């Protein structure tokens, strides 16, 4: 790359010699490294030795929230914030009230709609506006959140399985909840994947394999990991069971793999709004400096060959949560649409 | 820089060998160049040969807007596009005469005056703005590529305060301030209010000459630079308007030259500044041509106030904070601002 190397050192020299402020070579190369890695996609980046030490503590694909909780007291106030935590260092304190999360007012939202904004993949970012501070604050979802499928039997005999994240036991837990509620009365199963940031790819593949006897569930394009293709397997465990999937703009990664597999094999009717559009596998690359690189090494592809990253999954029938409609009413109306198939 | 060069080539190798997509050396170094130059500040960047050819067409510090106009002609609060010429950049993007613009930089035009709309539409030439049309569900990025000719807009208020609206500092601004103040001087004139709201700047020299009209001594502005050297512009003797009381009105869009003028008049206690903190833009940029035909736009100097305060990133705090209250009529705000100026010793 002699022609490119020559252009780079020429520019480096002009920057070092004419920028208003004299910068160190260590600072200039660090700016060059950030552009080299972050210029690949919106998820690849350089990690400082500390950002790396912090990221190794978390398991990849865990559901997480902030290092505190919000509770309504006549106003969503901060509570359980531990002294010395990253949020404490940024200025947050127990008692302060949060008015917005990612420009969305918490007035009129339920405890669930607030968790919907607070929850996300571990390591992810969110902004908060406090009534005290006059400016927004960037926080990191660094607190792992344990979850189980949340089942609800609707009056119309539709079993709703709320999956906030795919975990090692998700597939076995879907099997158990459907069977424990299965009978001549069960009409259909509605899988609520709204606000599901993903979780384990293997769990989404196993979950889809419960309802598919053949065909590719998902394919991966990778140079360092190789081009894999996960195929479904025979087993009429769930053949006569009608299935629906509910997604929102926060449904992502593994949740999109599962949704796409079920939709493109026409096994489930997908309702809601277009998914987030995140279909990447990242790997951490330690450096001698102690720092590291977080980089995309694989892209997920749907059975029809569609790239999930940047596109997202379009539902079979668009029906987002209408403005200020009550949650349990939206669930019932979504269940009604599924029964009319 | 052996330790940092070794780290850079190691990272380059990891990217080239493991990124999901095989990328060319030309593309990897280009991403490294963009991070190296854009990583300096929010105004420095690499320009492709085309981005450079486009930038040289515009004159530095000219006031500009989009290649069309907005006027409500359908409904009273729906701003429709008019004067859009076929073949223009906006026409190629999908905009058409008749379409309605609901937002500019996420701000609804619904309840705004013709002035508040120009406030969002106007800006330094080459600048960017986003627009949401009623016909589209997604935003559109436009460039202020149409220069806007201007003159000082004078208004004599009933309280005998002369308001001089300066949308941008130009070569004739100083002479025009002198002429408008003199042709309106009399035993009745109480004070002069310089309205610099939404003024993106213009020529530094024009702001310095404008401040020199009201100052007999002291530094108007200083420049800190390695490639240009540390210069400092001083005021000169000549009591042009010794007995003239002066006020300055600024908003969050008042910037660069407008901030230099405002800071000079404020820190020498020559004018009472009201409104809200200025934008905070005090940089001098230089273009660095490259053999590829491309170039680098980079900050080479910072402007400093008389007290030695840096304008870039700080902005100028007014003497008395008084932003346009919610839904207050413009003429009323101007009268209240003029009243505050008259209540000064
Ligand atoms: Cl080579
Ligand atoms: Cl060195
Ligand atoms: Cl020119
Ligand atoms: Na199967
Ligand atoms: Na003078």
Distance CA B182, CA B305 (A): 28
Q: Residue B221: which of B175, B188, B187, B268 has the closest Cα?
A: B268
Determination technique for this PDB entry?
A: X-ray
CA distances, B1 to each of B6, B7, B33, B201 (Å): 9, 10, 17, 40
Distance CA B311, CA B328 (A): 30
Q: Residue B153: which of B176, B124, B123, B172 has the closest Cα?
A: B176
User: For A19, which of B33, B35, B40 is closest by C-beta distance?
Assistant: B40
Provide CATH code, domain B67-144: 2.30.42.10
Distance CA A157, CA A160 (A): 9
Distance CA A278, CA A250 (A): 10
* A1: CB partners within 8 A, 6+ apart: B25, B26, B29
Q: Quick check: B103 contacting A, CB < 8 Å?
A: no
Helix (H) or strand (E) holding A161: strand A158-162
Q: Residue B130: which of B97, B98, B99, B108 has the closest Cα?
A: B108
Distance CA A61, CA A281 (A): 10
Q: Residue A162: which of A151, A171, A172 has the closest Cα?
A: A151
How close A41 comes to chain B (CA, Å)?
10
Distance CA A307, CA A280 (A): 10
Q: Quick check: A11 contacting B, CB < 8 Å?
A: yes
For residue A246, what are its two tokens?
């509910």
Q: What is the DSSP letter of A228?
A: E
Distance CA B70, CA B145 (A): 16
**Per CATH, which fold does A63-144 belong to?**
Pdz3 Domain (2.30.42)
Helix (H) or strand (E) holding B15: helix B2-18
CA distances, A281 to each of A60, A231, A299, B19, B146 (Å): 10, 19, 6, 11, 45
Q: What is the DSSP letter of B168?
A: S
Helix (H) or strand (E) holding A27: helix A25-38
The rounded Å distance from CA B36 to ligand 2 centre is 17
Q: A309, A276 in Cβ contact below 8 A?
A: no
Q: Which CATH number fits domain A150-339: 3.90.226.10, 3.40.50.720, 3.50.50.60, 2.120.10.30?
A: 3.90.226.10
Count CB atoms within 10 A of the CB of residue A181: 15
Q: A270, A261 in Cβ contact below 8 A?
A: no
Q: A275, A312 in Cβ contact below 8 A?
A: yes
Q: Residue A167: which of A291, A75, A64 has the closest Cα?
A: A64
Q: Could you tell me if residue B124 is left (phi over 0), alpha (psi between -120 and 50 degrees) or otherwise beta?
A: beta
Cross-strand pairs, B47: B295
Distance CA B213, CA B175 (A): 9
Instruction: Decide the pairing of beta strands B161-165 and B191-195.
Output: parallel
CA distances, A112 to each of A40, A108, A109, B60 (Å): 35, 12, 8, 52
Q: Residue A143: which of A168, A166, A115 has the closest Cα?
A: A115
Provide CATH code, domain B153-342: 3.90.226.10
Helix (H) or strand (E) holding A69: strand A69-72
**Mutual orientation of helices A254-264 and A201-209 as an angle, nearest 10°?**
20
- For chain B, residues classed under CATH 2.30.42.10 are 67-144
- For chain A, residues classed under CATH 3.90.226.10 are 150-339
- For chain B, residues classed under CATH 3.90.226.10 are 153-342
User: For A297, which of B8, B20, B299 is closest by C-beta distance?
Assistant: B20
Q: In the block, which residue shows the tokens 């009268």?
A: B335
Q: Quick check: A37 contacting B, CB < 8 Å?
A: yes
Q: Residue B273: which of B193, B208, B211 has the closest Cα?
A: B193
Cross-strand pairs, A76: A72
Instruction: Decide the pairing of beta strands A98-101 and A63-65.
Output: unpaired
For residue A191, what are its two tokens?
């899988």
Contact: A19, B300; criterion CB under 8 Å: yes
Judging contacts by C-beta atoms under 8 Å, the chain B residues touching residue A8 are 29, 32-33, 36
Distance CA B338, CA B195 (A): 11
The rounded Å distance from CA B8 to ligand 2 centre is 15
- For chain A, residues classed under CATH 2.30.42.10 are 63-144
Secondary structure (3-state) at B91: helix
Kindly give the residue spans of alpha helices, DSSP state H, lying in B248-305. 257-267
* B39: CB partners within 8 A, 6+ apart: A30, A31, A32, A34, A35
Contact: A39, B40; criterion CB under 8 Å: no
Q: Which of B5, B11, B138 to mutate to test the interface with A (most CBs of A within 10 A)?
A: B11
Residue of A nearest to B26 (CA): A4
Q: How many CA atoms lie within 13 A of A229 on its CB side?
A: 7
Burial class (CB in 10 A: 0-12, 13-18, 19+), A170: buried
Contact: A287, B224; criterion CB under 8 Å: no
């Amino acid at each position: 790359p002699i022609e490119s190397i020559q252009q780079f050192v020429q520019i480096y020299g002009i920057v070092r010699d004419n920028y208003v402020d004299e910068k160190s070579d260590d600072a200039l190369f660090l700016q060059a490294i950030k552009g080299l890695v972050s210029g690949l996609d919106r998820y690849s980046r350089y990690l400082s030795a500390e950002e790396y030490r912090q990221l190794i503590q978390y398991t990849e694909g865990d559901l997480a929230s902030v290092d505190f909780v919000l509770s309504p007291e006549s106003k969503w106030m901060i509570r359980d914030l531990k002294t010395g935590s990253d949020s404490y260092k940024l200025g947050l304190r127990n008692g302060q009230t949060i008015l917005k999360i990612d420009n969305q007012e918490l007035k009129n939202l339920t405890h669930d709609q607030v968790l919907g904004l607070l929850y996300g993949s571990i390591g992810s970012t969110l902004q908060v506006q406090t009534e005290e501070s006059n400016s927004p604050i960037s926080l990191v979802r660094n607190k792992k959140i344990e979850t189980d499928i949340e089942p609800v039997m609707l009056h119309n005999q539709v079993l709703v399985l709320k999956i906030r994240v795919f975990q090692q036991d998700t597939a076995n837990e879907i099997k158990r909840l459907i069977e424990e509620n299965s009978s001549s009365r069960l009409k259909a199963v509605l899988i609520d994947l709204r606000n599901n940031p993903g979780g384990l790819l293997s769990a989404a593949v196993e979950s889809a394999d419960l309802f598919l006897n053949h065909g590719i569930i998902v394919s991966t394009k990778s140079r360092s990991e190789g081009n894999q293709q996960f195929q479904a397997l025979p087993g009429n465990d769930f053949q006569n069971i009608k299935v629906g999937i509910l997604i929102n703009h926060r449904s992502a990664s593994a949740a999109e793999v599962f949704t796409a597999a079920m939709k493109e094999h026409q096994r489930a009717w997908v309702m809601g709004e277009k998914s987030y559009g995140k279909g990447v596998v990242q790997k951490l690359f330690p450096l001698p400096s102690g720092a590291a690189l977080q980089m995309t090494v694989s892209h997920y592809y749907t059975p029809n060959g569609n790239m999930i990253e940047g596109q997202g999954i379009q539902p079979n029938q668009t029906y987002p949560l209408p403005p200020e409609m009550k949650e349990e009413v939206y669930l019932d109306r979504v269940a009604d649409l599924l029964l009319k198939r």
